[PDB]
Amino acid sequence: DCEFGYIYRLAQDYLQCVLQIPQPGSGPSKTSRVLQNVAFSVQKEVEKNLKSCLDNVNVVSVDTARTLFNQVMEKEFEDGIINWGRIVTIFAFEGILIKKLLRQQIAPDVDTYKEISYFVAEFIMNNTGEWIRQNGGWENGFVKKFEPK
Ligand SMILES: */C=C/C(=O)N(Cc1ccc(Cl)cc1)c1ccc(F)cc1
């Protein structure tokens, strides 16, 4: 679960959850199901608290979304501290960007949404991957902290 493949699937699962397009074969993992729950809760909070801010930007391509996402990541982790709450926050932001991109993309390609999932997993992997592993990974760190009590 420290690998890219795992984090990519978590980011793509979150996207399909936001887009209301779930895959039929089996469904998401307990880990993804716990994540979609806590990340959606955060996303709605960020949507309300950042209302004015969001309604001003225009996400017209995957490249425009990569830039906005990097900008948000730059200010989310500027103090250098990582915690599960901030990791959940990354997922919430890709959800905000996919909603905006569905609404404002110049060439509405359906194969662009999986590119968001790619640069989200790349960011998580390269910038928080080590912290995640040392804190228990997804199945012994994230789930144990956020699964229903
Ligand atoms: C409204 C401020 C701004 O221009 N930001 C750009 C932005 C990036 C990503 C998303 Cl999902 C919406 C808007 C901005 C917002 C929040 C930040 F933490 C940094 C930059």
Alpha-carbon gap, residue 100 to 139, rounded angstroms: 31
- Residue 46: Cβ-neighbour burial (10 angstroms; 0-12, 13-18, 19+): middle
CA 130 – CA 62 distance, rounded (Å): 27
Instruction: Write the CATH number for 115.
Output: 1.10.437.10
Resolution (Å) of this entry: 1.9
Nearest protein Cα to ligand 1, atom 18: 72
Ligand 1 atom 7: the closest Cα is on which residue?
A: 68
In the chain, how many H helices and how many E strands?
A: 7, 0
Domain residues for the domain of 105 are 1-149
Q: Are 54 and 47 in contact (CB under 8 A)?
A: yes
Please tell me the total count of domains within the chain.
Answer: 1
Mutation choice for ligand 1 from 53, 62, 73, 103, CB with most ligand atoms inside 8 A: 53
Ligand 1: atom nearest CA of 93 is 11
| CB contact set of 135 (below 8 Å; sequence gap of 6+) | 84, 141
CB 99 within 8 A of CB 19: no
